[PDB]
Amino acid sequence: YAAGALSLADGAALVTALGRITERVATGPGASVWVRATEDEVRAALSGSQEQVGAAVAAVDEPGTTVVSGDAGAVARVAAHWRAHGRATGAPRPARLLLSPDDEQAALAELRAIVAGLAFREPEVPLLSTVTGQPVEPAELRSAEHWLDHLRGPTRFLDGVRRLRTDGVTRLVGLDLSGDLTGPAGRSAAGFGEPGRPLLLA
Amino acid sequence: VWHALAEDGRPGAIGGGTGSWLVFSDDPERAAAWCDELALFGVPAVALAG
Amino acid sequence: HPAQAPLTALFTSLVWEHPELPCAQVDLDPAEDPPTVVSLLGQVMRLPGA
Amino acid sequence: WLAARGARSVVLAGAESERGDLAGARTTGHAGIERLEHVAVDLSSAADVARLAELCADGRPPLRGVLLLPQPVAGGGLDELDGARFGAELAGALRGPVELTRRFTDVGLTGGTDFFVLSTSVVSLPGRAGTVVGSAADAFLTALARHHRQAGLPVVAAAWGPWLESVDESDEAPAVAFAEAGVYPAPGGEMLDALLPLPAAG
């Protein structure tokens, strides 16, 4: 909506569908944790043991932290493994992703039944997505597979913030009503590009 | 004369993880704290002590 | 503290003897809690030279 | 200069006073002055430094001004230096002026005086190549002077250029080097005239 790509009517509509799908995920049987280990440390452990399959990296917010989510047993054992080894983790919290392909076939239908009802238009300024880590194409925006990916794939915030600073952004404003989003933006931005370049976070 | 950097005193950005930062301190806890702080930003660091 | 004087001498001795190297002295308050290490390296990396 | 400004009782408190050709110094001391003494006194020794206070405790009129004159310190860069050498030579540079400054304060002569001046070089403000020990001594004496000045005692560290009378015609090479570097000589009387009315006024 801030990119001029939806009307207020379209924006109001879509948030209600993503809202209902989110209740199903949050009430589901799974869990999540934060871990003070990076994607190259965690992806190796998550791939390199059949005994814990049923988990994934849910978010990549800043260089020092990853969030793991899936089956509550798989989440608990992967959390404990790093606490025993040499890193901090949080206490358990609700899941953040779909937990069966049974969820996907319903959520796809519900989104396709609503996303065709959104009167989209080409954005006035570049719109970046945490599914893609790249500027959204107008053909991606119109497709419900792009919108359901928020419940399927990793939230690639870090790589998005990197592309803001390759592409010349200097000052970076945070609508921090929940999740403190400008903090992880500063912690992902101040370790990249040319030395001494300005960076204002407000 | 010590003059305030009141004009333009905003830290800017560290130039990427192209090489490590060594930290040496009289206090091993301070060396660890600064190496842990740098790690959150993806700037790789190593702690040393006498 | 008079015991700190060898550090200012060692700093100024580098500036005229190994001129290819950037270096900086950052004198902290001896009683307050030290700032975040990214605040040090940010305001240091804005110095070309010394 | 003490003669040219109306001094009366003076001690030349140093080892030089009983080995150098001071007959010319005593002869200019015929102007204004009335009492003059020489002591052979070793400022590096605690017992000899206690003898300075025992000489000042004589029936001679009370002490009201002090000047510790410039001293040569050995050369050396960061190369051709090591921890054993630096710990030896810095102690050789500092031990004299430290013990005198301490003792005169501990026996309560300091503060009952209008000026108490320690010599340092102007070269030690921005620094110079090949003088690691000389730089360290001037920085430490500046910190030592401030400690007493913040305690309300009128100690001053003076950062002077080469005195014109100290430009030795026997070997002019240090003065030639300083002239190309842009540190020019000045007459010692004009520098004392510019500094010594100040310590109680500003």
CA D153 to the chain's CA centroid: 17
Cβ neighbours for D161, distance < 8 A, ≥ 6 positions apart: D121, D122, D183, D184, D185, D186, D191
Q: Which residue has the tokens 């206090």?
A: B27
Of A95, A88, A39, A46, nearest to A62 by C-alpha is A39
**In A30-169, which ranges are continuous DSSP H helix?**
39-47, 72-85, 101-115, 138-141, 144-152, 157-166
Structure token pair of residue D147: 């400690």
Q: Is D42:D68 a contact under the CB 8 Å cutoff?
A: no
Contact B33, C40 (CB under 8 A): no
Q: Which residues of C touch B30 (CB under 8 A)?
A: 34
Which chain C residue has its CA at the smallest distance from A194's CA? Answer: C45
Instruction: Report yes or no: C31 at the B interface, CB cutoff 8 Å.
Output: no
Helix (H) or strand (E) holding A68: strand A65-70
Shortest CA distance to A34 belongs to which of A65, A76, A77, A73?
Answer: A65
Q: Do C37 and B9 touch (CB under 8 A)?
A: no
CA–CA distances in Å: residue A26 to residues A2, A29, A115, A180:
27, 8, 23, 20
Quoted resolution (Å): 3.8
Pick from D131, B2, D88, D141: nearest CA to C12: D131
Q: How far apart are CA A147 and CA A111, in angstroms?
A: 8
Q: What letter does residue A169 receive in the DSSP assignment? A: -
Residues D11, D12, D13: CA angle, nearest 5 degrees:
90
Transcribe chain B into DSSP letters: -----TTT--------SSSPEEEE-SSHHHHHHHHHHHHHTT--EEEE--
User: In terms of CA atoms, which chain D residue is nearest residue C10?
Assistant: D132
Axis crossing angle, helix A157-166 with helix A182-189, rounded to the nearest 10 = 60
* 3-state SS, residue A64: coil
The span from the CA of A93 to the CA of D120, in Å, is 66
How many beta carbons lie within 10 A of that of residue A177, not counting itself?
7
CB contact under 8 A, C45 and B34: no
Q: In what order do the strands lie in the sheet with A31-35?
A: A31-35, A65-70, A55-62
* CA gap A196, B13 in Å, rounded: 5
Secondary structure (DSSP) of D29-44: TTSS--EEEE----TT
**Rounded-to-integer distance, Cα C42 and Cα B11, Å:** 4
N residues, chain B: 50
Q: Do chains D and C touch (3 or more CB pairs under 8 A)?
A: yes
Torsion of CA D93, D97, D98, D101, to 10 degrees: -170
Is B37 an 8 Å CB contact of chain C?
A: yes
**Structural determination approach:** cryo-EM
What are the Cα distances from residue B2, in Å, to A190, A192, B5, C24, D157? 28, 31, 10, 15, 18
Task: Read off the tokens for B7.
Answer: 């004009």
